Design a protein around this ligand. Structure first.
Ligand SMILES: NC(=O)c1ccc[n+]([C@@H]2O[C@H](COP(=O)([O-])OP(=O)(O)OC[C@H]3O[C@@H](n4cnc5c(N)ncnc54)[C@H](O)[C@@H]3O)[C@@H](O)[C@H]2O)c1
Length: 401
Protein backbone atom coordinates (compact mmCIF):
# COMPACT_ATOMS: atom_id res chain seq x y z
CA UNK A 1 0.00 0.00 0.00
CA UNK A 2 1.23 3.52 -0.76
CA UNK A 3 0.72 6.52 1.52
CA UNK A 4 0.96 10.18 0.49
CA UNK A 5 -0.03 12.91 2.90
CA UNK A 6 0.59 15.48 0.19
CA UNK A 7 0.19 18.67 2.24
CA UNK A 8 -1.65 17.28 5.26
CA UNK A 9 1.00 17.91 7.92
CA UNK A 10 -1.03 16.67 10.91
CA UNK A 11 -2.13 13.33 9.54
CA UNK A 12 1.48 12.77 8.49
CA UNK A 13 2.57 13.73 12.01
CA UNK A 14 0.47 10.89 13.41
CA UNK A 15 1.99 8.45 10.92
CA UNK A 16 5.50 9.66 11.66
CA UNK A 17 4.74 9.53 15.35
CA UNK A 18 3.83 5.84 14.90
CA UNK A 19 6.73 4.62 12.78
CA UNK A 20 9.00 6.67 15.04
CA UNK A 21 8.18 3.88 17.47
CA UNK A 22 8.94 0.97 15.13
CA UNK A 23 12.54 2.10 14.84
CA UNK A 24 14.38 0.42 17.70
CA UNK A 25 16.31 3.52 18.79
CA UNK A 26 17.33 4.66 22.26
CA UNK A 27 17.26 8.39 23.05
CA UNK A 28 21.04 8.20 23.00
CA UNK A 29 21.03 6.91 19.43
CA UNK A 30 18.39 9.41 18.35
CA UNK A 31 20.65 12.13 19.67
CA UNK A 32 23.57 10.72 17.71
CA UNK A 33 21.45 10.55 14.55
CA UNK A 34 20.31 14.17 14.97
CA UNK A 35 23.88 15.36 15.45
CA UNK A 36 24.75 14.11 11.99
CA UNK A 37 21.52 15.56 10.60
CA UNK A 38 22.03 18.98 12.16
CA UNK A 39 25.61 18.68 10.89
CA UNK A 40 27.29 18.90 14.27
CA UNK A 41 31.03 19.46 13.68
CA UNK A 42 30.55 19.72 9.91
CA UNK A 43 30.16 15.95 9.71
CA UNK A 44 27.45 16.30 7.07
CA UNK A 45 29.50 18.99 5.35
CA UNK A 46 32.59 16.75 5.23
CA UNK A 47 30.72 13.46 4.75
CA UNK A 48 31.40 13.17 1.02
CA UNK A 49 35.11 13.87 1.52
CA UNK A 50 35.10 11.40 4.39
CA UNK A 51 33.78 8.56 2.21
CA UNK A 52 36.70 9.07 -0.18
CA UNK A 53 39.35 9.66 2.49
CA UNK A 54 42.52 7.76 3.33
CA UNK A 55 42.53 5.49 6.39
CA UNK A 56 43.39 7.21 9.65
CA UNK A 57 41.66 10.46 8.69
CA UNK A 58 38.38 11.60 10.25
CA UNK A 59 38.66 9.04 13.02
CA UNK A 60 36.01 10.40 15.38
CA UNK A 61 33.62 11.05 12.50
CA UNK A 62 34.14 7.45 11.35
CA UNK A 63 33.28 6.28 14.87
CA UNK A 64 29.97 8.15 14.67
CA UNK A 65 29.32 6.83 11.18
CA UNK A 66 29.86 3.29 12.41
CA UNK A 67 27.28 3.91 15.15
CA UNK A 68 24.85 5.48 12.65
CA UNK A 69 25.37 2.49 10.36
CA UNK A 70 24.24 0.12 13.11
CA UNK A 71 21.05 2.14 13.36
CA UNK A 72 19.79 1.65 9.80
CA UNK A 73 20.71 -1.92 10.58
CA UNK A 74 17.56 -1.92 12.73
CA UNK A 75 15.07 -0.33 10.32
CA UNK A 76 11.72 -2.08 10.13
CA UNK A 77 9.94 0.00 7.46
CA UNK A 78 6.50 -1.56 7.31
CA UNK A 79 4.61 0.86 5.08
CA UNK A 80 5.31 2.28 1.63
CA UNK A 81 4.98 6.04 1.40
CA UNK A 82 5.62 9.04 -0.83
CA UNK A 83 8.32 11.38 0.45
CA UNK A 84 9.08 14.93 -0.64
CA UNK A 85 12.35 16.83 -0.76
CA UNK A 86 13.49 19.93 -2.57
CA UNK A 87 17.10 20.31 -3.65
CA UNK A 88 19.29 22.62 -5.69
CA UNK A 89 20.17 21.22 -9.16
CA UNK A 90 23.87 20.99 -8.30
CA UNK A 91 23.12 18.54 -5.48
CA UNK A 92 22.08 15.86 -7.97
CA UNK A 93 24.77 16.58 -10.53
CA UNK A 94 22.72 18.84 -12.79
CA UNK A 95 25.24 21.52 -13.65
CA UNK A 96 23.35 23.57 -16.24
CA UNK A 97 21.50 26.79 -15.45
CA UNK A 98 18.05 25.53 -14.45
CA UNK A 99 16.05 28.69 -13.79
CA UNK A 100 15.85 32.34 -14.75
CA UNK A 101 13.73 34.04 -12.14
CA UNK A 102 10.53 32.15 -11.40
CA UNK A 103 10.77 30.40 -14.75
CA UNK A 104 12.29 27.17 -16.05
CA UNK A 105 14.72 27.97 -18.88
CA UNK A 106 13.37 25.34 -21.37
CA UNK A 107 16.72 24.20 -22.73
CA UNK A 108 17.28 23.37 -19.09
CA UNK A 109 14.38 20.92 -19.08
CA UNK A 110 15.46 19.33 -22.35
CA UNK A 111 18.93 18.90 -20.95
CA UNK A 112 17.41 17.84 -17.65
CA UNK A 113 15.18 15.09 -19.07
CA UNK A 114 17.99 13.85 -21.26
CA UNK A 115 20.25 13.40 -18.27
CA UNK A 116 17.87 11.84 -15.71
CA UNK A 117 14.58 10.52 -17.09
CA UNK A 118 14.42 6.71 -16.73
CA UNK A 119 17.92 6.89 -15.22
CA UNK A 120 19.13 6.18 -11.72
CA UNK A 121 20.34 8.96 -9.44
CA UNK A 122 23.06 7.99 -6.95
CA UNK A 123 23.43 10.18 -3.86
CA UNK A 124 26.50 10.75 -1.62
CA UNK A 125 24.90 10.25 1.79
CA UNK A 126 21.81 9.08 3.66
CA UNK A 127 18.80 10.71 1.99
CA UNK A 128 16.46 12.54 4.36
CA UNK A 129 13.04 13.42 2.95
CA UNK A 130 9.72 14.78 4.19
CA UNK A 131 6.27 13.23 4.59
CA UNK A 132 4.66 16.30 3.06
CA UNK A 133 5.59 18.65 0.24
CA UNK A 134 8.00 21.37 1.32
CA UNK A 135 7.85 24.98 0.35
CA UNK A 136 10.14 25.68 -2.58
CA UNK A 137 13.08 27.33 -0.87
CA UNK A 138 15.67 29.67 -2.35
CA UNK A 139 17.47 27.89 -5.20
CA UNK A 140 16.13 24.46 -4.22
CA UNK A 141 14.02 24.24 -7.36
CA UNK A 142 14.06 20.48 -7.98
CA UNK A 143 11.20 18.73 -6.20
CA UNK A 144 11.95 15.06 -5.51
CA UNK A 145 8.85 12.92 -5.07
CA UNK A 146 10.33 9.60 -4.04
CA UNK A 147 8.11 6.57 -3.47
CA UNK A 148 9.62 4.54 -0.64
CA UNK A 149 8.63 0.86 -1.01
CA UNK A 150 8.00 -0.79 2.37
CA UNK A 151 9.16 -4.10 0.95
CA UNK A 152 8.00 -5.73 4.18
CA UNK A 153 6.95 -9.18 3.00
CA UNK A 154 9.68 -8.52 0.46
CA UNK A 155 13.06 -10.25 0.16
CA UNK A 156 15.28 -7.41 1.41
CA UNK A 157 13.88 -4.98 4.01
CA UNK A 158 13.80 -1.30 3.05
CA UNK A 159 16.45 0.22 5.29
CA UNK A 160 14.46 3.36 6.02
CA UNK A 161 13.01 4.78 9.22
CA UNK A 162 11.35 7.82 10.72
CA UNK A 163 13.09 10.14 13.15
CA UNK A 164 11.87 13.23 14.99
CA UNK A 165 14.16 16.05 13.89
CA UNK A 166 13.56 19.78 14.39
CA UNK A 167 9.95 19.40 15.50
CA UNK A 168 9.30 17.20 12.49
CA UNK A 169 9.01 13.53 11.65
CA UNK A 170 11.24 12.70 8.71
CA UNK A 171 12.11 9.74 6.53
CA UNK A 172 15.74 8.58 6.64
CA UNK A 173 16.93 6.26 3.89
CA UNK A 174 20.16 4.25 4.15
CA UNK A 175 23.13 4.68 1.74
CA UNK A 176 22.35 1.56 -0.28
CA UNK A 177 19.58 3.14 -2.37
CA UNK A 178 19.37 5.19 -5.56
CA UNK A 179 16.35 7.01 -6.95
CA UNK A 180 15.16 5.67 -10.29
CA UNK A 181 13.58 8.60 -12.12
CA UNK A 182 10.17 7.52 -13.41
CA UNK A 183 8.68 10.80 -14.60
CA UNK A 184 9.87 14.40 -15.02
CA UNK A 185 7.64 17.48 -15.49
CA UNK A 186 7.34 21.23 -14.93
CA UNK A 187 5.21 22.23 -11.96
CA UNK A 188 4.34 25.59 -10.40
CA UNK A 189 4.34 26.24 -6.67
CA UNK A 190 2.98 29.68 -5.74
CA UNK A 191 3.99 31.37 -8.99
CA UNK A 192 7.41 29.71 -9.06
CA UNK A 193 8.29 27.07 -11.66
CA UNK A 194 10.25 23.99 -10.60
CA UNK A 195 11.06 20.55 -11.98
CA UNK A 196 9.57 17.58 -10.24
CA UNK A 197 11.21 14.16 -10.28
CA UNK A 198 8.84 11.33 -9.44
CA UNK A 199 10.86 8.27 -8.65
CA UNK A 200 11.20 5.03 -6.75
CA UNK A 201 13.93 3.70 -4.50
CA UNK A 202 16.21 1.12 -6.05
CA UNK A 203 18.56 -0.94 -3.91
CA UNK A 204 22.27 -0.95 -4.72
CA UNK A 205 25.01 -2.07 -2.32
CA UNK A 206 27.45 0.68 -1.48
CA UNK A 207 30.18 0.01 1.04
CA UNK A 208 31.58 3.52 0.63
CA UNK A 209 34.90 3.65 2.45
CA UNK A 210 33.96 0.32 4.07
CA UNK A 211 34.14 1.55 7.67
CA UNK A 212 32.63 -1.59 9.22
CA UNK A 213 34.71 -3.90 7.01
CA UNK A 214 31.64 -5.56 5.50
CA UNK A 215 32.96 -5.61 1.93
CA UNK A 216 35.35 -8.54 2.06
CA UNK A 217 32.69 -10.66 3.75
CA UNK A 218 30.08 -9.79 1.15
CA UNK A 219 32.64 -10.72 -1.46
CA UNK A 220 33.56 -14.05 0.10
CA UNK A 221 29.96 -14.89 0.90
CA UNK A 222 29.20 -14.69 -2.81
CA UNK A 223 32.37 -15.70 -4.60
CA UNK A 224 34.16 -18.13 -2.30
CA UNK A 225 32.36 -21.05 -3.97
CA UNK A 226 32.96 -19.63 -7.45
CA UNK A 227 36.65 -19.43 -6.53
CA UNK A 228 36.72 -23.04 -5.37
CA UNK A 229 34.96 -24.29 -8.51
CA UNK A 230 37.51 -22.76 -10.83
CA UNK A 231 39.60 -25.10 -12.94
CA UNK A 232 43.34 -25.05 -12.24
CA UNK A 233 43.68 -23.48 -15.70
CA UNK A 234 41.39 -20.65 -14.63
CA UNK A 235 42.72 -20.41 -11.10
CA UNK A 236 46.26 -20.07 -12.45
CA UNK A 237 45.50 -17.58 -15.22
CA UNK A 238 43.60 -15.37 -12.76
CA UNK A 239 46.56 -15.62 -10.43
CA UNK A 240 48.96 -14.66 -13.19
CA UNK A 241 46.72 -11.75 -14.14
CA UNK A 242 46.56 -10.45 -10.57
CA UNK A 243 50.24 -11.02 -9.89
CA UNK A 244 51.70 -9.13 -12.85
CA UNK A 245 50.29 -10.37 -16.17
CA UNK A 246 47.55 -7.73 -16.09
CA UNK A 247 49.93 -5.05 -17.44
CA UNK A 248 50.89 -7.15 -20.45
CA UNK A 249 47.35 -8.46 -20.97
CA UNK A 250 45.56 -5.10 -20.73
CA UNK A 251 48.08 -3.43 -23.04
CA UNK A 252 47.70 -6.22 -25.61
CA UNK A 253 43.91 -5.78 -25.50
CA UNK A 254 43.77 -1.98 -25.29
CA UNK A 255 46.46 -1.10 -27.81
CA UNK A 256 47.38 -4.11 -29.95
CA UNK A 257 43.96 -4.94 -31.40
CA UNK A 258 43.86 -7.82 -28.93
CA UNK A 259 45.42 -9.99 -31.61
CA UNK A 260 48.75 -11.60 -32.45
CA UNK A 261 49.81 -13.43 -29.30
CA UNK A 262 48.83 -17.10 -29.03
CA UNK A 263 50.07 -17.34 -25.44
CA UNK A 264 48.11 -14.38 -24.13
CA UNK A 265 44.96 -15.21 -26.10
CA UNK A 266 44.85 -18.53 -24.24
CA UNK A 267 45.32 -16.97 -20.80
CA UNK A 268 42.81 -14.28 -21.77
CA UNK A 269 40.31 -17.01 -22.71
CA UNK A 270 40.54 -18.65 -19.30
CA UNK A 271 40.30 -15.37 -17.48
CA UNK A 272 37.15 -14.35 -19.34
CA UNK A 273 35.57 -17.78 -19.04
CA UNK A 274 36.26 -17.66 -15.30
CA UNK A 275 34.79 -14.14 -15.08
CA UNK A 276 31.55 -15.25 -16.71
CA UNK A 277 30.77 -18.33 -14.61
CA UNK A 278 29.00 -16.26 -11.96
CA UNK A 279 27.22 -12.99 -12.83
CA UNK A 280 27.18 -10.31 -10.10
CA UNK A 281 24.38 -11.55 -7.76
CA UNK A 282 22.88 -8.11 -7.12
CA UNK A 283 23.11 -4.41 -7.90
CA UNK A 284 26.35 -3.13 -6.39
CA UNK A 285 28.47 0.00 -6.42
CA UNK A 286 32.18 -0.21 -7.19
CA UNK A 287 34.89 2.42 -7.30
CA UNK A 288 38.03 3.23 -9.16
CA UNK A 289 40.53 6.10 -8.89
CA UNK A 290 41.49 7.12 -12.44
CA UNK A 291 44.60 8.64 -13.98
CA UNK A 292 44.16 11.54 -16.43
CA UNK A 293 45.21 9.43 -19.45
CA UNK A 294 42.28 7.10 -18.77
CA UNK A 295 40.02 10.00 -19.72
CA UNK A 296 42.07 11.31 -22.62
CA UNK A 297 44.08 13.80 -20.60
CA UNK A 298 47.79 14.32 -19.88
CA UNK A 299 49.34 12.93 -16.72
CA UNK A 300 50.34 16.44 -15.67
CA UNK A 301 47.16 18.30 -16.67
CA UNK A 302 44.87 19.83 -14.05
CA UNK A 303 41.20 18.87 -14.26
CA UNK A 304 39.49 20.65 -17.16
CA UNK A 305 36.55 22.92 -16.30
CA UNK A 306 33.55 21.02 -14.95
CA UNK A 307 31.76 22.37 -17.99
CA UNK A 308 34.25 21.01 -20.52
CA UNK A 309 34.28 17.65 -18.80
CA UNK A 310 30.52 17.26 -19.16
CA UNK A 311 30.71 18.29 -22.80
CA UNK A 312 33.20 15.50 -23.40
CA UNK A 313 31.87 12.65 -21.26
CA UNK A 314 28.39 13.45 -19.96
CA UNK A 315 25.85 11.02 -21.41
CA UNK A 316 28.57 9.17 -23.39
CA UNK A 317 29.59 5.50 -23.27
CA UNK A 318 33.18 4.82 -22.31
CA UNK A 319 34.64 1.46 -23.27
CA UNK A 320 37.57 -0.66 -22.21
CA UNK A 321 39.04 -3.44 -24.30
CA UNK A 322 41.11 -4.53 -21.33
CA UNK A 323 39.79 -5.78 -17.98
CA UNK A 324 38.54 -3.08 -15.63
CA UNK A 325 39.63 -3.40 -11.98
CA UNK A 326 37.31 -1.78 -9.48
CA UNK A 327 36.81 -1.88 -5.72
CA UNK A 328 33.92 -2.34 -3.32
CA UNK A 329 35.61 0.37 -1.25
CA UNK A 330 35.88 4.04 -2.18
CA UNK A 331 38.81 4.22 0.26
CA UNK A 332 41.77 6.39 -0.74
CA UNK A 333 44.94 4.29 -0.92
CA UNK A 334 48.49 5.62 -1.25
CA UNK A 335 49.07 3.76 -4.54
CA UNK A 336 46.79 6.30 -6.19
CA UNK A 337 45.55 8.70 -3.54
CA UNK A 338 46.22 11.65 -5.83
CA UNK A 339 44.19 10.66 -8.92
CA UNK A 340 41.73 13.47 -9.75
CA UNK A 341 38.94 11.40 -11.29
CA UNK A 342 36.95 8.93 -9.19
CA UNK A 343 34.58 6.53 -10.92
CA UNK A 344 31.47 5.61 -8.96
CA UNK A 345 30.22 2.67 -10.97
CA UNK A 346 26.80 1.01 -10.77
CA UNK A 347 27.07 -2.68 -11.52
CA UNK A 348 23.54 -4.08 -12.17
CA UNK A 349 22.57 -7.56 -11.12
CA UNK A 350 23.78 -9.85 -13.91
CA UNK A 351 26.94 -7.99 -14.89
CA UNK A 352 29.84 -10.08 -16.18
CA UNK A 353 32.52 -10.07 -13.50
CA UNK A 354 33.71 -11.59 -10.27
CA UNK A 355 35.05 -10.71 -6.85
CA UNK A 356 38.65 -11.63 -7.66
CA UNK A 357 39.71 -11.40 -4.00
CA UNK A 358 38.04 -14.78 -3.52
CA UNK A 359 41.03 -16.58 -5.07
CA UNK A 360 43.31 -15.26 -2.33
CA UNK A 361 47.00 -15.49 -3.13
CA UNK A 362 48.62 -12.68 -5.13
CA UNK A 363 45.05 -11.36 -5.52
CA UNK A 364 44.26 -7.75 -4.65
CA UNK A 365 42.00 -6.15 -2.02
CA UNK A 366 38.21 -6.01 -2.22
CA UNK A 367 38.46 -6.20 -6.01
CA UNK A 368 35.60 -6.76 -8.45
CA UNK A 369 37.20 -7.48 -11.81
CA UNK A 370 34.92 -6.79 -14.76
CA UNK A 371 35.29 -8.87 -17.92
CA UNK A 372 37.01 -7.32 -20.92
CA UNK A 373 35.11 -5.27 -23.48
CA UNK A 374 33.18 -3.44 -20.77
CA UNK A 375 31.01 -0.43 -21.43
CA UNK A 376 29.40 2.03 -19.07
CA UNK A 377 27.18 5.11 -19.28
CA UNK A 378 28.37 8.30 -17.62
CA UNK A 379 25.29 9.56 -15.74
CA UNK A 380 26.47 12.63 -13.84
CA UNK A 381 29.62 14.41 -12.64
CA UNK A 382 30.00 16.14 -9.28
CA UNK A 383 32.87 17.55 -7.28
CA UNK A 384 34.52 16.54 -4.03
CA UNK A 385 37.51 18.20 -2.37
CA UNK A 386 39.64 15.57 -0.67
CA UNK A 387 42.41 16.84 1.59
CA UNK A 388 42.64 20.12 -0.32
CA UNK A 389 42.58 18.93 -3.93
CA UNK A 390 39.46 18.92 -6.11
CA UNK A 391 38.45 15.65 -7.75
CA UNK A 392 35.62 14.67 -10.06
CA UNK A 393 33.32 11.88 -8.96
CA UNK A 394 31.96 10.39 -12.17
CA UNK A 395 28.75 8.38 -11.66
CA UNK A 396 28.09 5.72 -14.27
CA UNK A 397 25.99 2.62 -14.94
CA UNK A 398 27.65 -0.52 -16.32
CA UNK A 399 26.01 -1.84 -19.50
CA UNK A 400 25.19 -5.51 -19.21
CA UNK A 401 25.37 -7.82 -22.23
N1 LIG B 1 42.91 2.61 -9.39
C1 LIG B 1 41.95 1.99 -8.72
O1 LIG B 1 41.07 2.62 -8.19
C2 LIG B 1 42.02 0.51 -8.43
C3 LIG B 1 40.93 -0.15 -7.79
C4 LIG B 1 40.89 -1.53 -7.49
C5 LIG B 1 42.03 -2.28 -7.84
N2 LIG B 1 43.18 -1.65 -8.49
C6 LIG B 1 44.43 -2.45 -8.72
O2 LIG B 1 45.58 -1.73 -9.17
C7 LIG B 1 46.23 -2.53 -10.18
C8 LIG B 1 46.41 -1.96 -11.59
O3 LIG B 1 45.23 -1.58 -12.32
P1 LIG B 1 44.57 -0.13 -12.24
O4 LIG B 1 43.09 -0.33 -12.37
O5 LIG B 1 45.03 0.75 -11.13
O6 LIG B 1 44.99 0.72 -13.54
P2 LIG B 1 46.05 1.85 -14.06
O7 LIG B 1 45.13 2.99 -14.21
O8 LIG B 1 47.24 2.11 -13.17
O9 LIG B 1 46.50 1.34 -15.55
C9 LIG B 1 47.66 1.88 -16.20
C10 LIG B 1 47.24 2.19 -17.62
O10 LIG B 1 45.98 1.62 -18.05
C11 LIG B 1 45.35 2.69 -18.74
N3 LIG B 1 44.21 2.60 -19.67
C12 LIG B 1 44.52 2.64 -20.97
N4 LIG B 1 43.44 2.51 -21.75
C13 LIG B 1 42.46 2.41 -20.89
C14 LIG B 1 41.11 2.24 -21.24
N5 LIG B 1 40.78 2.19 -22.54
N6 LIG B 1 40.20 2.13 -20.20
C15 LIG B 1 40.61 2.20 -18.92
N7 LIG B 1 41.93 2.36 -18.62
C16 LIG B 1 42.88 2.46 -19.56
C17 LIG B 1 45.80 3.99 -18.12
O11 LIG B 1 45.57 5.11 -18.97
C18 LIG B 1 47.28 3.66 -18.04
O12 LIG B 1 47.93 3.95 -19.29
C19 LIG B 1 45.61 -3.88 -10.23
O13 LIG B 1 46.49 -4.88 -9.73
C20 LIG B 1 44.32 -3.75 -9.47
O14 LIG B 1 44.08 -4.86 -8.61
C21 LIG B 1 43.15 -0.25 -8.78
Amino acid sequence: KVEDFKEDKEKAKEWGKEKEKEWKLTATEKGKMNNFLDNKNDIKTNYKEITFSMAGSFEDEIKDLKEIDKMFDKTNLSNSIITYKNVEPTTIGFNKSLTEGNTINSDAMAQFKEQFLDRDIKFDSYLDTHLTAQQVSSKERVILKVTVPSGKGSTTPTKAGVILNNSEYKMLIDNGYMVHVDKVSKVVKKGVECLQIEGTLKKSLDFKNDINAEAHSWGMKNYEEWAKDLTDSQREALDGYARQDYKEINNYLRNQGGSGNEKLDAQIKNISDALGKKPIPENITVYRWCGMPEFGYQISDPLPSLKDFEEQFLNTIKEDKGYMSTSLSSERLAAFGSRKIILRLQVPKGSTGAYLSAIGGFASEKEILLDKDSKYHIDKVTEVIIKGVKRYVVDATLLTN
